[PDB]
Design a protein around this nucleic acid. Structure first.
Ligand SMILES: Nc1nc2c(ncn2[C@@H]2O[C@H](COP(=O)(O)OP(=O)(O)OP(=O)(O)O)[C@@H](O)[C@H]2O)c(=O)[nH]1
Ligand SMILES: [Mg+2]
Ligand SMILES: [Mg+2]
Ligand SMILES: [Mg+2]
Ligand SMILES: [Mg+2]
Ligand SMILES: [Mg+2]
Ligand SMILES: [Mg+2]
Ligand SMILES: [Mg+2]
Ligand SMILES: [Mg+2]
Ligand SMILES: [Mg+2]
Ligand SMILES: [Mg+2]
Ligand SMILES: [Mg+2]
Ligand SMILES: [Mg+2]
Ligand SMILES: [Mg+2]
Ligand SMILES: [Mg+2]
Ligand SMILES: [Mg+2]
Ligand SMILES: [Zn+2]
Lengths: 180, 842, 52, 137
RNA sequence: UUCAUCUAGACAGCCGGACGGUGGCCAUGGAAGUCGGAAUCCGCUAAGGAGUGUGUAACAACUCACCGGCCGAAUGAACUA
């Protein structure tokens, strides 16, 4: 029964003629159940030392997984970030960008300025909903994200920091090709 | 600052456009009844000297030493202005002297009755807001209460002296809190303000916000500062007074204005608000609290000081109190925002008319109200009734919207129940004296136009709480003016000595008059109950009773609760009692009534004075019930009219018509005081199976049928699994979403269950309704308040009766421990007579 | 109102802890036994209760 | 673009609808057009823009099997349990399950169906847990 | 003393994911994993329970199992005296 899954991840051996190595930095499981609709880890790095050929093994550490489709190797290179994470943090997270906001109406009902006041943002009410005046930045590059500030952007005001679905390298029927 | 004249104020009541009918509004210890003090100085009344703490609209002696306004006392004031200021009125105006009709108001939730009373007779509102405490929970509720009758608000952010000293605040954050406040104040407006104005939002640059500390004596607004300093830079006011609020700065060494934070290439520039509207004031705190006196004068002189015969020999913090009151005196900021931005009676009655009219909202008088017409038939609402200063006799306090009112004038008073058609709350007597009011001294005036608030001595024999008196035959009333607190906390009042009772029953009548929603009534259980809106509100109402209205010693007690004796079985045996005269016998069983149909007479569909053949027909079909057993009914009970009935089920029996007299007699002695504990009963039917009457007559009187029957039915009661019906309230509360969880948390500890959970659109403001057993309901409202942070406003009414699956007859159970003590207190014994007595086993 | 960032910072020192069920002592939130010997370092530890 | 919950016949609303400039009465009466075999718990969907009502009916997988039962029912006249599970009608189960957006990352036409039949929660449906390696569609 | 996991990479620690049918059916004024009862099934799967905690009025958003990362060599649990 762990018989069964030693045998399973060595189960689908070679199968194909060209491939693509990828990374799983901050990507959903719903975000994966998407890509598999289009058809077109260390228990494996010894699989190759076993069934040998290739010397492609120095490319693996971090959260890595694998794809296969033999069609034009850039015809698939476009469903890559066809997914577009733009994950708005979990409940508060780290600062990978430089924060800012500008004026405009927000179309939200004026009962949510509760968050606004918690960050020293001047606000007024017009046309019925929350317009913002005199826009400012929350705090500097690489600094604090309060549950206040996150709680504001994260779900109130869709304005995230993208955590894309990337890809590192590829073997083109015998040797490997860095980028596009 | 000099007091002017009784009939001089009478003369400007004619110039309606210069009248300001408004109130003050804030959360409890926010500074308003001291704020008012600073204005009646600028009308003579109070000494400008150490008379800024004996707050005058706190007329009451307990209002004065508890330091909280209790009743919404009132005062009208005469005021001077300068022509330079009286141009900026976008409503027709007349001269340079105005009359402010104000109500300083209590701001506890228990007293929201006094503020809704204060608003209904006013057009404007001045909301006070502590800087430190900001906008607390009651501010939001009394803001809702103003827009509820469409009042225009203007704000003043107060006790900013707390901001400087206790909070060691810098300049920008202090501004930032001002920003933080005004933002949250307008989000209240954009939800409840009537979507008929829009212009009712509040912003400081538009001159609808002030800043100060009414205790220390001073206030300002950006407009009062706009002119004051635009007179030297020679530049304008309009675009200038936009540059002082918000992100717009100046940057000296560059000498031209800015747009956004602008940074000035490192360490940015401060808002016009900071170095140019507060750099004066902060230096006063810093350079006189830190005692820099050698700096004090020539810094005093840089910014236009003046001293006194004692104030120069008076340095910091008693200095700051004394210098800044002279720097930016209070009324100047206030009169500005009140005369400029608050609606005169004519500019206000025209949109509050149609909604404030009981009859057709275009009635011939509502016309003359919109016009603020002082010549129509007199049209006036009395909102409160205020103690006389003699023994218990009440001016009536309202505002008139049409015609005039003269001392000695015949008038029809139309109470809350009147319609123009027939005999209703219509008394037709005259007014002894019209009189306009101050800090309880009133000044008799003989004639008063429309659009002003006044008193009225000569009535209150004819009013009970509120009323609307007119001069036209068919002038409809005014809408009934419901407040957000309903009379929920309640106790029973008995008089300590046995004979003061007459003084106690007039006191309740006199008490009902005083507070707009104190209730007093006789209960089914036979008590005088005095109900209020909070455990605190009830305190004062009884203080006012034990001393003034009743003036006798009386002690209070939780009210006794009315149960009913009922059945839920069909006689675990049959039943037979005999007589003293052991010659006659009755046989019967007793069964429960479908609670559906016991209602059917409680709602008056089956009655004794009516006739059967219809009694029979109705009950048979739909009521899981018989057709001929609904013909041979004999009587109701108790009181001849109650929901416990009898019918005949016996064979060719001896002499039933000459005891039908005496069987209903005993039936009535059993239905208002039965077994378990002698309360009235409901929902049990009794059917008679055989009867053995003696012969002759005198061996069958009432004296032998009624002692058997009352005996012979109690027997049939305890057989049929006796149960008691506890009374249940239907309670509705309006609560915001935030603390809505505190409602369900109390409802189950107090054994409630919700019927409907719903929200008002846009509002948070849910309104949950539930069934509350009154047994588990005492102190409930006060504990719901703490469970909600005061953000809940319950409103209870009786709904129905309910049995209990806990068992009554056992004293251990939590439905028999209730009537455990019901006997001991009532004066009875330990257990309740077993069915073995009342049943002659033979 | 303590600003949310530091309401949780202090909450970590005062509110978010564990205590001993028979020694009453205050103990690190993840800790497994009590450090005080009077209770013989009993493992019976509850978390320190929190407010509202 | 919004969505609703279980409604049999009729339908609270304006807590979210009146603030959205919609006269909520014209929509709650119209919401009984997508809600009426057919009276059970079903999801809804409304997506409009500054106008009158525009609301649709969604493919609640729970609902399809319920109509595919003895749809004879009365509201509160039953008072026991909604054990309305009638004949599995495995073909109609497939048509509904096929119509279900071919969602759940549908590998097979049957990969969608194995989720539907697995709702032995819904009722008897003559056989709970149908076969595994069978014919397909 | 007994039984377990680990170079096919364990234990701790730190980091990424924690799905879809679907708010599953019973009921509930309201119960969407998280008052509760019963069906504890399935699909996509490197994996995710018809859901181990906080929380909501109900959702939310935080959480864990469960799946990978990083580190590379030993660790875990119930017991006895
Ligand atoms: N530091 C400071 N304290 C103030 C200021 N204004 C009022 N207070 C204090 O606040 C307290 C309550 O205010 P009051 O004016 O007496 O009455 P109110 O609070 O407006 O009305 P109630 O709801 O009936 O209590 C008083 O005891 C004052 O001492 C102020 O401007 N600065
Ligand atoms: Mg006084
Ligand atoms: Mg007194
Ligand atoms: Mg006061
Ligand atoms: Mg305080
Ligand atoms: Mg008196
Ligand atoms: Mg019957
Ligand atoms: Mg009922
Ligand atoms: Mg612990
Ligand atoms: Mg590990
Ligand atoms: Mg799911
Ligand atoms: Mg549930
Ligand atoms: Mg829950
Ligand atoms: Mg499975
Ligand atoms: Mg969730
Ligand atoms: Mg984890
Ligand atoms: Zn210990």
């Amino acid at each position: 029964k762990k018989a069964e899954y030693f045998a399973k991840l060595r189960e689908y051996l070679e199968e194909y003629k060209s491939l693509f190595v990828v990374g799983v930095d901050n990507v959903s499981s719903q975000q994966m159940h998407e890509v598999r609709k289009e058809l077109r880890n260390t228990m494996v790095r010894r699989a190759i030392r076993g069934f040998l050929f290739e010397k492609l093994l120095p490319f693996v550490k971090g959260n890595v997984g694998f794809v296969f489709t033999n069609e034009p190797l850039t015809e698939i290179k476009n469903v890559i970030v066809s997914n577009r994470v733009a994950a708005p943090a979990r409940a508060g997270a780290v600062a990978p960008e430089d924060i800012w906001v500008r004026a405009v109406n927000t179309g939200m009902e004026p009962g949510k300025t509760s968050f606004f006041q918690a960050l020293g943002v001047p606000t007024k009410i017009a046309r019925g909903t929350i317009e913002i005046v005199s826009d400012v930045k929350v705090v500097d590059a690489g600094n604090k994200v309060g549950q206040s500030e996150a709680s504001l952007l994260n779900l109130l005001n869709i304005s995230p920091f993208t955590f894309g679905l990337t890809v590192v390298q590829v073997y083109d029927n015998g040797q490997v090709f860095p980028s596009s | 600052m000099v007091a002017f004249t009784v009939d001089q104020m009478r003369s400007l009541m004619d110039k309606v456009t210069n009248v300001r009918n408004m109130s003050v509004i804030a959360h409890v210890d926010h500074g308003k009844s001291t704020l008012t003090d600073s204005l009646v100085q600028r009308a003579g009344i109070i000494s400008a000297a150490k008379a800024g703490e004996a707050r005058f609209t706190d007329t009451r002696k307990d209002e004065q030493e508890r330091g909280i306004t209790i009743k919404s006392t009132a005062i009208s004031l005469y005021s001077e202005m300068s022509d330079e200021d009286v141009k900026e009125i976008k409503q027709k105006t007349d001269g340079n002297s105005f009359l402010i009709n104000l109500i300083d108001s209590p701001g506890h939730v228990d007293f929201s009755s006094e503020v809704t009373a204060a608003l209904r007779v006013t057009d404007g509102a001045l909301v006070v807001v502590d800087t430190i405490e900001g906008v607390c929970v009651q501010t939001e509720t009394v803001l809702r209460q103003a827009l509820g009758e469409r009042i225009k608000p203007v704000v003043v952010i107060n006790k900013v002296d707390r901001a400087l000293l206790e909070l060691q605040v810098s300049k920008e954050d202090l501004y930032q809190t001002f920003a933080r406040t005004v933002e949250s104040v307008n989000v209240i407006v954009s939800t409840y303000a009537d979507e008929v104005l829009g212009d009712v939002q509040v912003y400081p640059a538009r001159g609808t916000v002030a800043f100060g500390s009414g205790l220390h004596g001073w206030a300002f607004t950006i407009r009062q500062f706009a002119t004051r300093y635009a007179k030297k830079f020679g530049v304008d006011k309009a675009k200038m007074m936009d540059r002082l609020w918000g992100d717009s700065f100046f940057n000296p060494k560059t000498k031209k204005w800015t747009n956004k934070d602008t940074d000035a290439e490192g360490k940015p520039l401060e808002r016009a608000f900071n170095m140019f509207i507060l750099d004066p004031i902060f230096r006063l705190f810093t350079a006189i609290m830190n005692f820099k006196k050698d700096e004090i004068p020539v810094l005093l002189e840089k910014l236009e000081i003046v001293l006194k015969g004692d104030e120069k020999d008076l340095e910091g913090k008693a200095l700051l109190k004394v210098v800044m009151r002279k720097f930016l005196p209070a009324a100047d900021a206030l009169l500005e925002m009140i005369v400029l931005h608050l609606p005169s009676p004519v500019t206000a009655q025209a949109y509050r008319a149609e909604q404030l009219y009981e009859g057709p909202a275009d009635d011939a008088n509502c016309i003359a109200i919109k016009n603020c017409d002082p010549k129509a038939d007199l049209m006036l609402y009395v909102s409160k009734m205020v103690p006389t200063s003699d023994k218990g006799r009440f001016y009536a306090f309202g505002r008139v919207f049409a015609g005039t009112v003269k001392s000695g004038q015949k008038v029809r008073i139309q109470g809350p129940n009147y319609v123009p058609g027939k005999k209703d709350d219509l008394f037709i007597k005259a007014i002894q004296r019209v009189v306009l009011m101050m800090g309880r001294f009133v000044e008799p005036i003989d004639d008063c136009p429309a659009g002003n608030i006044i008193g009225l001595v000569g009535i209150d024999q004819f009013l009970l709480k509120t009323g609307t008196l007119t001069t036209s035959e068919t002038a409809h009333n005014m809408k009934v003016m419901k407040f957000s607190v309903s009379p929920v906390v309640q106790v029973a009042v008995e008089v300590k000595n046995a004979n003061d009772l007459p003084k106690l029953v007039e006191g309740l009548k006199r008490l009902s008059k005083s507070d707009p929603c104190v209730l007093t009534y006789m209960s089914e259980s036979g008590e005088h109950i005095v109900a209020g809106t909070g455990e605190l509100h009830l305190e004062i109402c009884l203080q006012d009773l034990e001393h003034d209205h009743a003036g006798v010693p009386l002690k209070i007690s939780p009210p006794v609760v009315a149960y009913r004796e009922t059945v839920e079985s069909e006689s675990s045996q049959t039943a037979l009692s005999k007589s003293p005269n052991k010659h006659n016998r009755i046989y019967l069983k007793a069964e429960p009534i479908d609670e559906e149909v016991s209602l059917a007479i409680e709602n008056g569909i089956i009655n004794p004075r009516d006739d059967f053949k219809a009694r029979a027909r109705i009950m048979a079909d739909d009521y899981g019930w018989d057709v001929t057993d609904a013909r041979k009914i004999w009587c109701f009970g108790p009181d001849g009219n109650g929901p416990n009935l009898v019918i005949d089920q016996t064979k060719a029996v001896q002499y039933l018509h000459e005891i039908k007299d005496s069987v209903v007699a005993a039936f009535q002695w059993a239905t208002k005081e039965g077994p378990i504990f002698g309360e009235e009963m409901r929902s049990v039917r009794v059917n008679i199976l055989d009867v053995t009457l003696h012969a002759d007559a005198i061996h069958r009187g009432g004296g032998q049928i009624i002692p058997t029957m009352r005996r012979a039915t109690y027997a049939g009661f305890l057989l049929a699994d006796p149960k008691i019906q506890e009374p249940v309230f239907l309670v509705e509360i309006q609560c915001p979403e935030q603390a809505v969880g505190g409602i369900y948390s109390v409802l189950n500890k107090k054994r409630g269950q919700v019927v409907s959970e719903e929200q008002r659109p846009g509002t948070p403001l849910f309104t949950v309704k539930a069934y509350l057993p009154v047994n588990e309901s005492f102190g409930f409202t006060g504990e719901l308040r703490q469970a909600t942070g005061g953000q809940a406003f319950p409103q209870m009414v009786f709904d129905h009766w309910s049995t209990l699956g806990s068992d009554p007859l056992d004293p251990t159970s939590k439905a028999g421990e209730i009537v455990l003590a019901a006997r001991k207190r009532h004066g009875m014994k330990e257990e309740v007579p077993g069915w073995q007595e009342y049943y002659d086993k033979l | 109102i303590i600003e949310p960032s530091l309401k949780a910072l202090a909450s970590k020192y005062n509110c978010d802890k564990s205590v001993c069920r028979k020694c009453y002592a205050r103990l690190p939130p993840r800790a497994t036994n009590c450090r005080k010997r009077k209770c013989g370092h009993t493992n019976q530890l509850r978390p320190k209760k929190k407010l509202k | 673009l919004y969505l609703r919950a279980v409604g049999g016949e009729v339908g609270l609303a304006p807590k979210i609808g009146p603030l959205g400039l919609s006269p909520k009465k014209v929509g709650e009466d119209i919401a009984k057009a997508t809600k009426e075999k057919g009276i059970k718990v079903t999801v809804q969907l409304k997506i409009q823009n500054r106008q009158a009502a525009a609301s649709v009916v969604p493919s609640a997988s729970s609902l399809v099997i319920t109509a595919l039962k003895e749809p004879p029912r009365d509201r509160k006249k039953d008072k026991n349990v909604k054990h309305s599970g009638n004949i599995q009608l495995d073909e109609i189960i497939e048509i509904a399950r096929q119509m279900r957006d071919k969602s759940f990352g549908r590998t097979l036409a049957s990969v969608t169906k194995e989720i539907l039949g697995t709702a032995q929660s819904v009722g008897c449906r003559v056989d709970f847990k149908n076969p595994h390696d069978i014919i397909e569609g």
